[PDB]
Amino acid sequence: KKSTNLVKNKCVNFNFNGLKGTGVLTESNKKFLPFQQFGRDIADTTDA
Amino acid sequence: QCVNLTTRTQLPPAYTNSFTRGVYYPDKVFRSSVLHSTQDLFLPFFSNVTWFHVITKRFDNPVLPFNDGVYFASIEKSNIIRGWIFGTTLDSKTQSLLIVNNATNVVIKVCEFQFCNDPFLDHKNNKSWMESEFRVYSSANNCTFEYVSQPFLMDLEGKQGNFKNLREFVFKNIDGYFKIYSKHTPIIVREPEDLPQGFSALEPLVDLPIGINITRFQTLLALHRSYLTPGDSSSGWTAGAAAYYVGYLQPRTFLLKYNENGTITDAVDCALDPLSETKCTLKS
Ligand SMILES: *[C@@H]1O[C@H](CO)[C@@H](O)[C@H](O)[C@H]1NC(C)=O
Ligand SMILES: *[C@@H]1O[C@H](CO)[C@@H](O)[C@H](O)[C@H]1NC(C)=O
């Protein structure tokens, strides 16, 4: 479809790689696995 | 065309206990500093696995089954084990799958192969070490899938050093999707008897939408022939020291302790002994 810009800390709707959601998209400093791109917490909610 | 092989020595299969082996990431989601309960297909803890050795000449090339996924471990030094065949009949009556790590590429073929009863592993090694003959199958009628990976060079030189390769693989086949998880490690100079203790997590590597049925699988070897191996096309050859362990997967509930970077530092079963069940139910 389309390729837009990147929005810094501000309440904005997002569809990162086809992941519909709403929330502030801040920077993160957590190491990742080079086969997974998702992220969850104790409550099993998308976080990163 | 193919020929029946001879001069093989029969030995009963040995058994060895598995020490905390066969743990892989089950999904594509990253978690940090949690204790997650996953009900998936794993290798049961402290279950024992089948042992095969190759060096009489110890020609061990049997036909093992494929129930619900397979854990395959290999202690190796010079890439003796190369190829992997999967199928139901292996006589061109039904589709079959094949992975070959030959000199050209990593070839994956989903074809109606009329596999021989004893497919050779010719790899005729002159002063230089390449493959000169190919008698794995005879012909294919009309197949579906061919894939060739990135072309890379390979040595095949007859290295006869110490054991420094430990390769672990997990095979799954769910809903027509064939999945390979893997982990390769250089093992230190160590006594060559069995697989040491410790932990390791197998990152997912390959997913293929083959959509075929697999019931039986077989491994292949790399026989080397020189002036020291007199004989006809199926008598004189050299194999080299290597061993491989085979285990079968079962549906179990595990508890994995994700570390604070994202890797599985430890895992515990929930059906082995009452202490494990207590740990599972208390999530501690
Ligand atoms: C290992 O597994 C085989 C599977 O048939 C079983 O016969 C044997 O009792 C098990 N235990 C040992 C110590 O070999
Ligand atoms: C990764 O692991 C090691 C120790 O566990 C260390 O580099 C660091 O604490 C961890 N986290 C990072 C690098 O973000």
- Determine contact, residues B210/B59, Cβ cutoff 8 Å: no
Cross-chain residue pair B203–A39, CB shorter than 8 Å: no
CA atoms of B169 and B77, how far apart (whole Å): 17
The approach used to solve this structure was cryo-EM
What are phi and psi for residue B116, nearest 5 degrees? Answer: -70, 160
Distance (angstroms) between ligand 2 centre and the Cα of B32 equals 12
- Chain B residues whose beta carbon lies within 8 Å of the beta carbon of residue A31: 261-262
Cross-chain residue pair B25–A42, CB shorter than 8 Å: no
What are phi and psi for residue B11, nearest 5 degrees? Answer: -135, 140
Ligand 1 atom 10: the closest Cα is on which residue?
Answer: B48
A36 at interface of B, judged by CB pairs closer than 8 A: yes
CA atoms of B166 and B192, how far apart (whole Å): 11
Cross-chain residue pair A33–B30, CB shorter than 8 Å: yes
In total, chain A counts a number of residues equal to 48
CA atoms of B78 and B163, how far apart (whole Å): 9
Which secondary-structure segment (H or E) carries B170? strand B165-174
Tokens 């080079």 sit at which residue?
A34
A28 at interface of B, judged by CB pairs closer than 8 A: no
- The residues near B282 (Cβ < 8 Å, ≥ 6 apart) are none
Q: Which atom of ligand 1 is nearest to the CA of B15?
A: 14
